Amino acid sequence: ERFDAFICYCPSDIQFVQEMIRQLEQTNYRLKLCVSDRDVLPGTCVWSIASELIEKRCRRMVVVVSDDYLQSKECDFQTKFALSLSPGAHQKRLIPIKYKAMKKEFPSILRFITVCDYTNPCTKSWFWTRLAKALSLP
């Protein structure tokens, strides 16, 4: 009915989505993440159910950015639809995440929003803390 965040990801990054479920849902943060392969019911229009969840049934949206993420078209529609809700990031709704080594360019439409970097070994301690705090604010 009401989720804390929608998780935009390609099938190749589903392994890190499991970590996002263990670290945020099964811990003391008690966040309510929306995973399409788990919570989206079959028979729904992939564009209409994404437009209905991201805009009304999810406060924010997490984007797992990787090289395989760029090749995904469904993630492309969800990412651009998320920016359309607040271009300029006034509401802090679009939270991109980099967990893997990317040999391609970061999405140019997301180059002006803070990214939660998981690959930097000097800031791994604050990764889940900053992520769970952003999804917890109203």
Author numbering: 159 to 296
Question: What did the original publication write about this model?
Answer:
MyD88 and MAL are Toll-like receptor (TLR) adaptors that signal to induce pro-inflammatory cytokine production. We previously observed that the TIR domain of MAL (MALTIR) forms filaments in vitro and induces formation of crystalline higher-order assemblies of the MyD88 TIR domain (MyD88TIR). Here, we present MicroED and SFX structures of the MyD88TIR assembly, which reveal a two-stranded higher-order assembly arrangement of TIR domains analogous to that seen previously for MALTIR. We demonstrate via mutagenesis that the MyD88TIR assembly interfaces are critical for TLR4 signaling in vivo, and we show that MAL promotes unidirectional assembly of MyD88TIR.
The MyD88TIR microcrystals were studied in parallel using SFX. By using a micro-focused beam (nominally 1 × 1 µm full width at half maximum (FWHM)), and optimizing crystal concentration (7.5 × 108 crystals/ml), high-quality diffraction patterns from individual crystals were collected. Overall, the SFX dataset comprised 4725 indexed patterns from 13,528 hits (35% indexing rate) out of 1,029,868 detector frames (average hit rate of 1.3%). To enable a direct comparison between the MicroED and SFX models, we also solved, rebuilt and refined the SFX MyD88TIR structure using an identical protocol as described for the MicroED data (SFXb). The MicroED and SFXb MyD88TIR structures, which were built and refined using the same protocol, are almost identical, with a root mean square deviation (RMSD) of 0.4 Å for 138 Cα atoms. Minor differences in some side-chain conformations can be observed, which is most likely due to the flexibility of certain regions resulting in poorly defined electron density or as a result of the difference in the data collection temperature. The lattice parameters derived from the SFX data were found to be slightly larger than in the MicroED data collected under cryo-conditions. Our room-temperature SFX data also showed a slight increase in lattice parameters along the a-axis, when compared to the cryogenic MicroED data, indicating the lattice change is related to the temperature difference between the two data sets. In our investigation, only subtle differences were observed between the MicroED and SFX structures, which may be explained by the differences in the data resolution and completeness, flexibility of certain regions, and difference between cryogenic and room temperature data collection.
